[PDB]
Each structure stands twice: as structure tokens, then as C-alpha cells.
Amino acid sequence: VGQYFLYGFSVPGLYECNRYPCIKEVECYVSRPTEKTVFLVFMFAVSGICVVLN
């Protein structure tokens, strides 16, 4: 449940952030999103299989 609520399914390649150091909203880029989301989906499937067995 925590993994589902925290990370989700897909990893956004493009992010928009606006904190104190940055004067206005800025656009940052993430590296290798596809591999991260694929492996996250695989981990979620493995956890679901383990839950079903339990």
C-alpha cells in the first residue's frame, strides 16, 4: 500500500518545480524514466504475486 501510494506506476520524465532558491517555476528533466517505471511495475507485480500467495 505504501509503495502504491508513494511512487505510483509511471515516472514522469519532465518535472516542474518552484522552491525558494528558484525565482520562478522551472522545468527539469529526468534520465532513464522508462527503465525506472518498467522495473517499478515489475516490483509491483512481484509484490502482488507474493500477496496472493500469502
Ligand X SMILES: CC(C)CCC[C@@H](C)[C@H]1CC[C@H]2[C@@H]3CC=C4C[C@@H](OC(=O)CCC(=O)O)CC[C@]4(C)[C@H]3CC[C@]12C
Is residue 52 involved in binding a second copy (CB under 8 A)? no
Residue 26 binds which entry of a second copy, ligand X, ligand LMT, none, CB below 5-8 Å type-dependent: a second copy
Cβ 31 vs Cβ 14: under 8 Å: no
Tell which positions 1-40 bind ligand X, by CB under 6 A: 9-10
Query: For residue 54, how far is the Cα from the chain centroid?
Result: 26
Is residue 4 involved in binding ligand LMT (CB under 6 A)? no
Is residue 7 involved in binding ligand LMT (CB under 6 A)? yes
